[model samples]
Target: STTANKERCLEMVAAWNRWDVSGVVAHWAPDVVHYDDEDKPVSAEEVVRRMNSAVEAFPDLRLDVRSIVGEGDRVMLRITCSATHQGVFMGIAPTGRKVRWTYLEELRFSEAGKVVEHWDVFNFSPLFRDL
Candidate 1:
C-alpha cells in the first residue's frame, strides 16, 4: 500500500524531472523556507524562481531520483541531476559540457501536505571548477 506521503514525495521528483517549476511550487506552503548549499535561507518565491531559471538555462536538465525516505511530515530524497550548460552557471559561460551532480534534500510538510521547509545539500565546486 502506498501512503499519501510517499506518493507526494514521488510526485515532487516527477515534477522536478519535468522541469515544472509551477508544479513543484504548488506543493510548497506559502511560508516555505529553503536553505541552499551555501546555507543561505531563501523564500518560497525565490526557490521557485531559481528552479525556473535553472530550467531555462539548461533546457535539457533531468533529475533522477536515487532514493526517498519519509515518515509522517518529514521526507528526504537523494537525487542525481544531469544537464548541459547552455547559459552562465557560477560565473562560467556555457561550456556545452554535460554535467552531473548529486544532491540531497529534506522536506518538512505542513498539515495540508505542502512542503513548509526544505534543506538542500550539494557539491557545487565541481560544477564550476571542473567544467
Candidate 2:
C-alpha cells in the first residue's frame, strides 16, 4: 500500500533542495487549491513558479525537516533552512550571505493521498538581518 499524498508531499519538499521539478509535481492533483485561510486560490503552476524563483536565488537551498507527523488527511512539518543568497530574491539584491529561516507547514491530503491544500508559517528575519 502507498500513501501518495504524504509521501509525495515529502518529495515535493525534497525537490526544493535540488530543484527537481518532476519530483515536486509527482502526486499533485489538478484540483489543488490554496490554503483555507488564503483570500484567493493559487494554482499549481504558481507553486512551480515560486519554486523556480526560490531555486534561482538559493542554488544551495535545502529544507531540513526538524519535525513531521502524518495523521490521515493531515501532514504537519517543521523545517529549518539557511539559503546562501546566490542571486536576487524578494526584490533584493544578492547579499551573498546565509539567510537562515524556519517554517511550519500544514498540508491537507486528498482521498487518494494526493496533497491538495497547504498553509505555512515562515520566518524571514534572517534574510533581512543585514538590514
Candidate 3:
C-alpha cells in the first residue's frame, strides 16, 4: 500500500509539472475535503477554483519538489513554486514580476487510491510584500 501511494503521489506531481489541472483534479475523490490551515474543511470545487485562479495569475507557474515522503495512506510534499505574474491576483494588478516561494502540501488517499483529503500550508507574504 505504501508503494502504491508513493506511485500515485508521483503521478500527481507529474500532472502538475505538465500544467494539467484536470489531471490533478482527476486524482481526487468526488467528496474530497481540503484544508488550508483552516478549522473548516473546504469542498473540492473551492480548491479547484483557487488553483485555477493561481494559474490565471501565474500562467507559467511550476512546482519543483524539494522532497516527497509517503507513509501508509499519507503522502507529504515540500515544493518550491515559481511563476511569472501575468494576471490579477488577490486584487493586485499584474506586475509582470517573477516570484518564487516554498510550500508544503499533504494528501491522504483512500483504499481505492484516490486522494480523499488534502492540506495546503503556504504563506502568501511573498505576494503582498514589495510586489
Query: What residue pairs are clashing in model 3?
Result: none
Scored by lDDT, the top model is 3
Q: Would you give me the overall lDDT of model 2?
A: 0.75
Report per-prediction Cα RMSD to one decimal: 2.1, 2.4, 1.3
Instruction: Return whichever of 1 and 3 wins on lDDT.
Output: 3
Against the true structure, candidate 3 has what lDDT?
0.84
- lDDT tens per residue, model 1, 87-125: 876456788888888888788888788878889888665
Deviating ranges (above 4 Å) for candidate 1: 38-40
Better of 1 and 2 by lDDT: 1
The alpha-carbon lDDT assigned to residue 111 of candidate 3 equals 95
lDDT of 3 at 109: 95
Rank ordering of all candidates by TM-score, starting from the highest: 3, 1, 2
Error of 2 at 105 (Å): 1.7
Give the range of the ten consecutive residues with the poorest summed lDDT in model 2.
34-43
- Alpha carbon lDDT of residue 44, candidate 1? 66
TM-score for each of the candidates: 0.88, 0.85, 0.92
Give Cα distance to truth, residue 54, candidate 3, Å.
Answer: 0.8
Candidate 1 local lDDT, residue 20:
81
